[PDB]
Design a protein around this motif. Structure first.
Motif, PDB file in Angstrom:
ATOM      1  N   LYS A 175       0.740  -1.147  -0.189  1.00 21.15           N
ATOM      2  CA  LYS A 175       0.121  -0.070   0.066  1.00 21.15           C
ATOM      3  C   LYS A 175       0.749   1.298  -0.080  1.00 21.15           C
ATOM      4  N   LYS A 176       0.347   2.354  -0.659  1.00 16.87           N
ATOM      5  CA  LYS A 176       1.047   3.672  -0.664  1.00 16.87           C
ATOM      6  C   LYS A 176       0.753   4.182   0.868  1.00 16.87           C
ATOM      7  N   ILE A 177       1.483   4.358   1.680  1.00 20.49           N
ATOM      8  CA  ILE A 177       1.057   4.761   2.984  1.00 20.49           C
ATOM      9  C   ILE A 177       2.218   5.756   3.267  1.00 20.49           C
ATOM     10  N   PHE A 178       1.719   6.730   4.378  1.00 22.40           N
ATOM     11  CA  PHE A 178       2.519   8.007   4.576  1.00 22.40           C
ATOM     12  C   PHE A 178       3.313   7.425   5.870  1.00 22.40           C
ATOM     13  N   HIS A 179       4.353   7.040   5.752  1.00 21.89           N
ATOM     14  CA  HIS A 179       5.165   6.635   6.891  1.00 21.89           C
ATOM     15  C   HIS A 179       6.827   6.773   6.706  1.00 21.89           C
ATOM     16  N   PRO A 180       7.345   7.398   7.931  1.00 21.58           N
ATOM     17  CA  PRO A 180       8.825   7.693   7.541  1.00 21.58           C
ATOM     18  C   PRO A 180       9.602   6.382   7.140  1.00 21.58           C
ATOM     19  N   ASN A 181       9.162   5.004   7.517  1.00 19.62           N
ATOM     20  CA  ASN A 181      10.148   4.112   7.396  1.00 19.62           C
ATOM     21  C   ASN A 181       9.882   3.222   6.076  1.00 19.62           C
ATOM     22  N   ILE A 182       8.985   3.779   5.156  1.00 12.21           N
ATOM     23  CA  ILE A 182       8.348   3.019   4.154  1.00 12.21           C
ATOM     24  C   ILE A 182       8.315   3.906   2.803  1.00 12.21           C
ATOM     25  N   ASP A 183       9.077   3.689   1.703  1.00 14.76           N
ATOM     26  CA  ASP A 183       8.995   4.631   0.565  1.00 14.76           C
ATOM     27  C   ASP A 183       7.650   4.136  -0.414  1.00 14.76           C
TER      28      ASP A 183
END
Length: 190
Positions: free
Chosen positions: A103-111
């Motif tokens: 999933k496209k998610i807003f998280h510092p540790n996932i691009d």
């Protein structure tokens, strides 16, 4: 290489073919270990797991593959569902599975490509760690996001900019909204 190694590899392939033709083929070391990790799982209700391709196949070419679905019941991402694919090669547990966020998610540790920055997947990996550890680690990313491994700089910045700010950005993006000019997936259903 060497002519001997050559001959040894070729005998090994022959053995592999023989094994795959038996009823009840012997499973590779990697697949036996993954079965044991799967058989030993102790998941919290916030994590569900689907076996996509099983370690039970004798087909070398079909890598085992799991889908892991994290649905936190607390924190910034509460009640959002983030799914991951875990792809195992024949070298588990020497190497951990490849982990891809789906999933496209807003998280510092996932691009935005689905790459996941989790220490146990590389510098802190040990063959004495297991699937339970990986899964717990994926959960913990959402319970305690860290701005110090910033694959997504916008999220890393916002997390530093305070909790109400990051909380609302996460709520927007999880509902399919956009931050800057990138659109994130709606992951809040049900």
């Amino acid at each position: 290489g060497s002519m001997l190694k050559l001959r040894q590899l070729q005998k090994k392939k022959q053995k592999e073919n023989e094994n795959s033709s038996s009823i009840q083929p012997n499973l590779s070391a990697a697949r036996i270990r993954l079965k044991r990790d799967l058989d030993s799982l102790d998941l919290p209700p916030t994590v569900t797991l689907n076996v996509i391709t099983s370690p039970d196949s004798a087909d070398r070419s079909q890598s085992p593959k799991l889908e892991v679905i994290v649905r936190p019941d607390e924190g910034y991402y509460n009640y959002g569902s983030i799914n991951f694919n875990l792809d195992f090669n024949e070298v588990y547990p020497i190497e951990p599975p490849k982990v891809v966020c789906l999933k496209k998610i807003f998280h510092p540790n996932i691009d935005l490509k689905g790459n996941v920055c989790l220490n146990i997947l590389r510098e802190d990996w040990s063959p004495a760690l297991d699937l339970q550890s990986i899964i717990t680690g994926l959960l913990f990313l959402f319970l305690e996001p860290n701005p110090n491994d910033p694959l997504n700089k916008d999220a890393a910045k916002l997390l530093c900019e305070g909790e109400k700010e990051f909380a609302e950005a996460v709520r927007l993006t999880m509902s399919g909204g956009s931050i800057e000019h990138v659109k994130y997936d709606n992951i809040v259903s049900p």
